[PDB]
Design a protein around this ligand. Structure first.
Ligand code: HEM
Ligand SMILES: Cn1cc([C@H]2C[C@H]3CSC(N)=N[C@@]3(c3ccc(F)cc3F)CO2)cn1
Ligand SMILES: [Zn+2]
Ligand SMILES: [Zn+2]
Ligand SMILES: [Zn+2]
Ligand SMILES: [Zn+2]
Length: 464
């Protein structure tokens, strides 16, 4: 069939100089259509735009697009056939076993005695107190959001939290944010292309220094956890559940439940739901000071449904359509993973008539879905009524895809939904946020990366 169109491919760089990225893709979408091609050096890339193209790839051809592009340099971090974690894992048994394990263990810890909801609610309390200490004084809330969000994951993985001034905790969070920067590095591409370049010890020790440091700090914490683990009792957290599975899997070279995969799985879970959920909440609080009237309606609904003392529960959401709409609109407008996470075709597939060869790198332009002018009333405005009808009922459009879609859709979404609702309501239940008098109106345009964060800003949190 016909291959997707695209700008003229230069000899060596191809379309590398035709892309400086979501803004640039919008122009290409308006010039070549919703499915265009790109030649990024050695890698053949097809960009998918709009709900239909994205759905057709990830749902209709879900079996064939659930794979990841190979990342050879992950060998430095100890990746192997039965140890690929979940996030970057190739489509196959190693991915599926860990995927099913994480999803089911989240659910098991989730239901019963609401361990998840309890850990979040309790961490929300700490976040409130830490906010109270920063009162009467403008302050960036990002650091506190990272910590509270990080503690929720630590609670699920290792069954503990860390104090906000814990030295090892800070180093962990610091190493994690530096590591994220290392993923968007130019040297990553060269070494992924030619794996034998890693046989140079000079280079190998430079590639993922912050990644390796992060995994080292994590190893130390895992070792402590293995000491306190009581195998005579039902697993209290995901790491214990993993360790129990490891015992049963002794003698089985096919199991992905092993030492090498434990640190990778934990690192995937710990980080993927630390910079995403926290950035979303950082967007949330920014949008609340830019739109004080929206903030007041939320706080009003909080009082009408929950009050100003009793801690919020997930059962309250069903009776809080407006707050729910606001949170959704934060994710939509926030648009924090505009190009999602790359997929790869494991077979020859067909998208929007065009042909996609096997082994093609797929980019899901999630931004083009969340900001679709054909779907949303005013997609470039912060507008909670994107999820409300005239009667005030919450409505969720098909195009709400911040967690992507299909087999590889965010496994942490249920937890994320929980963290977002409980942290947001709890903060707005006890605080009123506003721009600091004397300071310029903070921009609503984010700083582009693999993850789009709000521009740096300060705020005032006055108690209620
Ligand atoms: C606002 C919060 C979050 C957003 C917007 C978000 C978004 C995403 C996106 C776009 C993907 C890519 C899906 C794809 O490859 O097509 C993804 C995958 C993933 N997310 Fe999240 N995420 C969030 C929070 C979390 C949390 C809390 C966790 C874990 C506790 C988590 C863990 C993961 C993992 C492990 C994957 C890989 C799944 C797989 O490859 O099978 N994320 N997420
Ligand atoms: C959805 N989404 C998750 C992300 C996260 C996922 C994590 C874990 S797995 C990975 N490959 N990179 C991340 C990551 C990797 C190493 C590290 F030291 C810190 C990290 F945050 C960055 O992107 C960004 N968007
Ligand atoms: Zn831990
Ligand atoms: Zn434990
Ligand atoms: Zn209605
Ligand atoms: Zn209060």
């Amino acid at each position: 069939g016909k291959l997707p169109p695209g700008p003229l491919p230069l000899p060596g760089l191809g379309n590398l100089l035709h892309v400086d990225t979501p803004y640039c893709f919008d122009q290409l979408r308006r010039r070549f259509g919703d499915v265009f091609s790109l030649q990024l050096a050695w890698t053949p890339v097809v960009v998918l735009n709009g709900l239909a193209a994205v759905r057709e790839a990830l749902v209709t051809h879900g079996e064939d697009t659930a794979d990841r592009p190979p990342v050879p340099i992950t060998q430095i971090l100890g990746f192997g056939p039965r140890s690929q974690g979940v996030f970057l894992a190739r489509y196959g048994p190693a991915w599926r076993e860990q995927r099913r394990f994480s999803v089911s263990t989240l659910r098991n810890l989730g239901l019963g005695k609401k361990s998840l909801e309890q850990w979040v609610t309790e961490e929300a309390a700490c976040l409130c107190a830490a906010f109270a200490n920063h009162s009467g004084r403008p302050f960036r809330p990002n650091g506190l959001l990272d910590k509270a969000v990080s503690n929720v994951i630590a609670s699920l993985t290792c069954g503990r939290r860390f104090e906000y001034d814990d030295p090892r905790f800070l180093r962990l969070l610091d190493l994690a944010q530096e590591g994220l920067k290392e993923e968007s590095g130019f040297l990553r591409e060269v070494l992924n292309a030619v794996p034998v370049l890693l046989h140079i010890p000079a280079l190998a020790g430079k590639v993922l220094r912050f990644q390796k440091a992060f995994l080292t700090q994590l190893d130390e914490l895992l070792t402590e956890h293995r000491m306190t683990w009581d195998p005579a009792q039902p697993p209290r957290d995901l790491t214990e559940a993993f360790l129990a599975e490891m015992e049963k899997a002794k003698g089985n070279p096919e199991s992905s439940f092993n030492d090498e995969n434990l640190r990778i799985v934990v690192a995937d879970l710990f980080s993927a739901g630390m910079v995403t959920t926290s950035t979303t909440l950082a967007w949330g609080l920014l949008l609340m000071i830019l739109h004080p009237d929206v903030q007041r309606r939320v706080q009003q609904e909080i009082d009408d449904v929950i009050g100003q003392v009793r801690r919020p529960e997930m059962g309250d959401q069903a009776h809080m359509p407006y707050t729910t709409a606001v949170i959704h609109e934060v994710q939509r407008f926030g648009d924090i993973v505009p190009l999602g996470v790359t997929h790869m075709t494991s077979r020859d597939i067909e998208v929007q008539g065009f042909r996609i060869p096997k082994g093609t790198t797929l980019i899901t332009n999630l931004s083009s879905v969340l900001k679709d002018e054909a779907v949303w009333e005013k997609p470039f405005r912060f507008h909670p009524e994107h999820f409300l009808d005239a009667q005030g009922h919450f409505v969720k459009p098909e195009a709400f895809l911040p967690f992507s879609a299909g087999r590889r859709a965010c496994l942490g979404e249920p937890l994320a939904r929980m963290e977002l609702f409980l942290f947001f309501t709890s903060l707005l239940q006890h605080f009123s946020f506003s721009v600091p008098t004397g300071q310029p109106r903070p921009s609503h345009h984010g700083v582009f990366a693999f993850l789009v964060s709000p521009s740096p800003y300060e705020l005032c949190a006055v108690p209620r």
